[PDB]
Every structure is written in C-alpha cells, then in structure tokens.
Copies of this chain bind each other. A is one copy, B any other.
Amino acid sequence: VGDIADVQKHASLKRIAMQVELHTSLEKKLPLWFLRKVDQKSTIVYPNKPSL
C-alpha cells in the first residue's frame, strides 16, 4: 500500500517520462540521414474536419 501510493504520487508524470525516455533511447541509435527525412518541424491539425 505504501509502495503503490508512492508510485501513484507521480503516476501522471511517470507515463510521460517513459514516453520521453523511449524516444531518446531510440533516436540515439537511429541514423541521422533518416532523421532529416522523417522530421517535419511543424504540424497542421484540423479539429473539426475528422503547488503550495
């Protein structure tokens, strides 16, 4: 119980941290010429077409 409440204190951060660290572990081994082809640097999204 004390272990799970420690994890769920940062549960919303831990999922995004695993998302970020996945890519940074992935792009470190990826060849750089492929990166320039695959990155697009900007995006266009149509919304309605489809503490103390």
Chain A residues with CB under 8 Å of chain B are 1-2, 4-5, 8
Contacts and interface: CB of A to CB of B under 8 A. Distances in A.
Contacts of A2: 1, 4-5, 8
Contacts of A4: 1-2
Chain A, interface SS category: helix
A7 to B, nearest CB: 9
**Which 6 pairs from chain A and chain B are nearest by CB?**
A2-B5, A1-B1, A2-B8, A2-B4, A1-B5, A1-B2
A12 to B, nearest CB: 13
Nearest to A4: B2
A2, A4, A5: most-surrounded residue (chain B CB, <10 A): A2
